[PDB]
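Cross-posted from the bioinformatics board.
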Amino acid sequence: RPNRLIVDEAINEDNSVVSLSQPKMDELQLFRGDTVLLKGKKRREAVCIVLSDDTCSDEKIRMNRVVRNNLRVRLGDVISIQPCPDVKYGKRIHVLPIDDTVEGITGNLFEVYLKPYFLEAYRPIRKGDIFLVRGGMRAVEFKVVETDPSPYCIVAPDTVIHCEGEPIKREDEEESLNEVGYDDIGGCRKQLAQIKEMVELPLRHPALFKAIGVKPPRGILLYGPPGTGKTLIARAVANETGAFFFLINGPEIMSKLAGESESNLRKAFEEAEKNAPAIIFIDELDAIAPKREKTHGEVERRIVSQLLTLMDGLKQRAHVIVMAATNRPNSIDPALRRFGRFDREVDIGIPDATGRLEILQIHTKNMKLADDVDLEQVANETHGHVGADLAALCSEAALQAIRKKMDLIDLEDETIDAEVMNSLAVTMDDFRWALSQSNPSALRETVVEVPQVTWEDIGGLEDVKRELQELVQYPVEHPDKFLKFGMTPSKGVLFYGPPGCGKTLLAKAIANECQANFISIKGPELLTMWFGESEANVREIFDKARQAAPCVLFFDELDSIAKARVINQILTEMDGMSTKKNVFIIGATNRPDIIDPAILRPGRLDQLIYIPLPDEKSRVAILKANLRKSPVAKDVDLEFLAKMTNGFSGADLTEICQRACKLAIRESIESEIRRERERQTNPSAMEVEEDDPVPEIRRDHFEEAMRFARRSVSDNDIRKYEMFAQTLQQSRGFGSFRFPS
Amino acid sequence: NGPEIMSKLAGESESNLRKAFEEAEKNAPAIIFIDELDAIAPKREKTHGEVERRIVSQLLTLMDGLKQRAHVIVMAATNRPNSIDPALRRFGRFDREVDIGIPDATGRLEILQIHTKNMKLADDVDLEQVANETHGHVGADLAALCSEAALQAIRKKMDLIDLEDETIDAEVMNSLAVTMDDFRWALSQSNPSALRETVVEVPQVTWEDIGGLEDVKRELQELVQYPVEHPDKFLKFGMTPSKGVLFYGPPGCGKTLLAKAIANECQANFISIKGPELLTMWFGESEANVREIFDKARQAAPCVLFFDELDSIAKARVINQILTEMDGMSTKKNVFIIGATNRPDIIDPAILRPGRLDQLIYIPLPDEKSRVAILKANLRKSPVAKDVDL
Amino acid sequence: NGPEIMSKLAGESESNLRKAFEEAEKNAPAIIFIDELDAIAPKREKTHGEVERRIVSQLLTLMDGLKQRAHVIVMAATNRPNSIDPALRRFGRFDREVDIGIPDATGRLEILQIHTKNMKLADDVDLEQVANET
């Protein structure tokens, strides 16, 4: 579609002028004296007269700076140009000096800055246009805020003046830059795409959506842990299109008196239908509508009923949707989770590591940075922070970088010199100081992301890998062929084996191969439910996984609650879970005989995969996996470590590499305690050649650390699990028969 | 409306209810409907303030102040009929009670036939296919399912319906029809169903799903078929019927698949509560929470409520409540209680006392002419080569 | 003061808090101090009436309605930081938290050096002796 063109630099000084190309004249049919609208970023536009020149390229417009800034476009971004035949003369655009280069002149300046500048051009000026006028070494920009014609105006010199107000400072610009775009959000990208598909496609097209018969959503809960900018995503979804925003703050409508708060909610809902198809956002919905237990007085119940009535009294013709944001979607009064009021529900949870990059890219935008700083390094580090925690992290790093310069920035420096204000950049160890020493993270809860441990982290075990492929890979990667002959899929296996053979490290591997989501609740997170008698508190971790349907929720030592229940609730939700969703439940254990036989009943956990001790071609993979970080000398052999440690568990040779690491750190601090202990310390023959005694683990560090190796599992327990494998059937019967001819 | 008369101020809501009742006698023999009655009349535990009790008393007075000459009836709709203030479940106020429960599979067809009325459909779409699929949705869930299928069909065409197409061309507005895999996408990948509770419908497993066992079949005919299909001949010589047997046998010999078969033959209704749904009552000490599943079955009187591994609550109670309602249940209703177990010796001997569970039918392992029927039953879906012998 | 704004009548205490916050922006970049915050904002269990919840919501709104251009910070002081309504421990309202705990022995010296400033002392008195003691 020949509408959008790239923008490059210009030479000319004339203003409200856009450059079109001369080889393409007959498609547009507009001559020189026609007014046009120019589409810019973040849904803000400007108007111009055209210039037809040859100095522009074929797809590139040469335009001046102030309308490049009113469209908010920079080098590479692509803008649109369109004709607008509604050009007309107007009365009293409201100019206002928004610059500090007025130099304290007041009164009528408009006889030398306005009237000779606008004429003999038919200058089109839109509301919010930021054109400047320079006169007498005074570059004052006149941003109009009140235009009686619509949308733009042509200034007449016969227009009477109205300029009694006072020129103001940069705050009116600061309440217009927070008409934010999609770029100001990270860490919730897939959910932003989902909520965009839920909201904007009704909002941008309200005609064919009602004409087809698809229902617009009437309520979207933005639930999730606090501080991740749940209101910022509502302002983003609003201001990216022609949507009106309205922010019903939570406790602000509870701060009012009795009876008047219902009038506040009625005014808030009436101002939605006053404006366009709009969007109202009610943050902290639990403060005005908690669960019915925490409703002591009657005024909260009256306000909750008023909100329910105002929600149900909506129209399909109103085209206004409502959003809210709590922490956990069981913490709302469940009367308003019914149909027609709040049906859809999206989880802007905690961001993952790759989503944690851009959320501090947007916070380190306006700061000077060093070279040693690596945002990927702090990305894979701090796995458990939220976006406001990262803002506090950046703020504390800035304070640490200021604090390390206060030895020469003294208090006697009253008028502060601007040398530090353009020559200070935060470096890497300041980030490490602000991250490790300070900022306790505000996060404990479950996490949902794909894992990253590949299949070559535990090599071998090809039978277990092939079985897990047939049980997890195929009902996701090939859903149609399962309905060819209609075999219903299974719903999860039960791993069992000795402690520390890579049970969890294998259960994450199929999630990493399928690119499926993965939660992980453990034993201690399990039995704290029934130590506190929260037996009916697994429904939320089940439908958390159902919210991210390609998932594998992984229990861990689920026989630990059989130390004598919550098995009965974990079973009734396993049966209540439908099978079309591909969520699988793989649990692991260490004593598979103490487990409840009802959970091994066919229908909920059928297969019993036995993870043995790691074999020869696997222990070379585990030693090649734990040695990813630490450098190893090339003469250090690991294949010789394979056929020397036969019956060692996987959790045991992860210790002997931590033992050889600990021994090499002992040799390094041993060297650094005698390097500075120089007697007859001559300043001559300086340390331009460093010692560097142990830049990697040597062979004798391994040969000394190997002498403290110890097998954790005995021979009596591997013999116990083999006896459990034969207590299990594994074709306990005939075998090797054939069919008659 | 329910919360709309609770959104008003104090005292004026009683005037709203008085205006609402007076406008009934203003017009013809009429019908007033009060949705979400629990919001204005919850159980007496959840009445903290006094204004709710005044409104509840006002509703009770306006209900009892009706006339037989007024010819106006009142309706209300809650979720569960124990969640109302039981003062207004008395006589003269709310006597009758009907259960518009979750629809079955054959009732699920027309409820999306009415939702796909104004849409263009393809040929690969089969409403019977989505009918026997999604057994646990409600009608608003199916409206959301149809809406999400329409959104999926729009979303698969946005590669050529671009944002630069400002004035939208009407070509898609008369040439787009949702097809089968869009319904499968909206059903399987999305729409978590808003339903867990019990279900009431006739089953569909016939008698040839477990062939043979003719002695057990003949006994179940004499114990279930005859007090329904021939109620008058039982009063000829006046033998009182029994009230249910106790199946017992090895795990997985088609106990439940047999207990559904007599329900399918009698065309009687069938609920099914299981072991884990049983012992979660007394893990939470909800021992007096079986009255509702008994009179749920009494609401659908030709029914066979089927327990399953009812010795699982004998892992050490709710047996005492399940017994006192079994004795309290009248015998003119033909509701039978057939329970199954795997360890019939650990069971409580009070439940085998003659009067509540008398017969003890022993389901053995399936014999020769039955295993051919089970392999001819599990192979209904998947195609099998003709040279494969069963 | 904490209980002083709870000693007022209903409705007028919110006007007291609004006056207190408005007098901050009346003056310079300032600092308001609310001692005994649990008396006006306890945990949600110990909120029987509705007036405490209205006052807590008023404080939350006045806290969130601040500006980066106002340059006024707020301080509070309770005994244990679980004894406050955890709605106001969120981000943007009360993020940082410092522990002025019990002083140690070497910190116990100067805290009675400032109390024995205006008294005549003998020679046998040893403040280090009462420092490592008590």
